[PDB]
Design a protein around this ligand. Structure first.
Ligand SMILES: Cc1ncc([N+](=O)[O-])n1CCO
Ligand SMILES: Cc1ncc([N+](=O)[O-])n1CCO
Lengths: 204, 204
């Protein structure tokens, strides 16, 4: 900055910058519903958090990484998991569930300590998960499998999904209520001009 | 299998297999506390789930991916995040938190549909997170930064962490109560011998 330069020789914020008019004007890095849909469609791993009763009787969350598929027409995401707790902290046949899908890029170095960061694209989904049965379960497991293994066809590449398979597997539809989408994918973190610049080890 | 071979020409479970005596005998793919510690030490991204009050008054979980560091002597993990809800579904100055760290490898194809899987190593941590202040916060942010950017030194590579930095940042210590560790990192999924084997596109 001038003040520092001049001090050596003896704000930023409101001053000119380039802006691409095509960029999102939404606060807090937020993204469009179309962007969220496309991120969900290309992802294959998610974390799901649901609530279980703990030892003190209080609800607490599990976090389970698992394969998933977004089914846009049905308005859900499907996954299977045999991970359970004792009792769900939940009244009813479905349970509230949060699901997260992200694309995490590179860590971004800076000579400014609070500008250290990582590239990310991230979706949070809020809804109700329910266990599927029978041909509902078989269809969801098929969509899932054929999604995460492109080119695989259940019944051809693999034997068909049998009744025994289904008895041994808990398959869920997370029916979507709300979602959120956030991206910060800069190529370089904000740097501090008035401190020695990072060397080529860092940015090269 | 014989039965199928013979049927064409016209159990597995209890029969001989190789076992490495060095392998974990724990059920459900579980791992030692030493293994959990080492996984936590090499990781740099975690998800944290904490509970917020929702619209119907019920608690529900957020899932936040963030940079983290395990501090074994202190018995905690530290991270910063400005993500908040309305009110935490929580009595007190700390809040219950679950933290997840995983290494996710390749998706593993099979001609058996319920053997489709993905390689993973995964830790679940259960504890109480509390906001840090002052030199506690500065030290934790330094450990974090110098962990996720090896070779970076706060105060040298970057300007020091200032009081303004600290006012703008919520830095947490998740004090560990319990943890869990799980691994399934096979090189190949279990296949079904009595269905056409996968072609070289899949396993080659
Ligand atoms: C710990 C874990 N990481 C990935 C998975 N997975 O894909 O089933 N798992 C299994 C349990 O959710
Ligand atoms: C959505 C997201 N993905 C990664 C991050 N991050 O590293 O801060 N974030 C930011 C908020 O947690």
């Amino acid at each position: 900055s001038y003040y520092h330069h001049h001090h050596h020789h003896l704000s930023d914020f409101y001053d000119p910058r380039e802006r691409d008019p095509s960029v999102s004007r939404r606060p807090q890095n937020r993204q469009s519903d179309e962007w969220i849909r496309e991120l969900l469609l290309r992802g294959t791993i998610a974390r799901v958090a649901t609530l279980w009763q703990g030892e003190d009787g209080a609800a607490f969350p599990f976090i389970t990484p698992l394969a998933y598929a977004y089914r846009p027409e049905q308005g859900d995401l499907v996954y299977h998991t045999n991970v359970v707790g004792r009792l769900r902290a939940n009244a009813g046949q479905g349970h509230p569930a949060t699901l997260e899908v992200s694309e995490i890029g590179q860590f971004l170095p800076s000579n400014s300590p609070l500008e250290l960061s990582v590239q990310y694209r991230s979706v949070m989904v809020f809804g109700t998960a329910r266990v599927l049965a029978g041909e509902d379960a078989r269809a969801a497991l098929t969509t899932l499998s054929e999604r995460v293994f492109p080119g695989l066809k259940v019944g051809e590449t693999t034997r068909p999904i049998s009744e025994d398979d289904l008895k041994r597997t808990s398959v869920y539809s997370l029916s979507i209520d709300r979602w959120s989408g956030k991206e910060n994918w800069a190529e370089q973190a904000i740097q501090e001009e008035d401190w020695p610049a990072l060397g080529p080890e860092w940015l090269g």
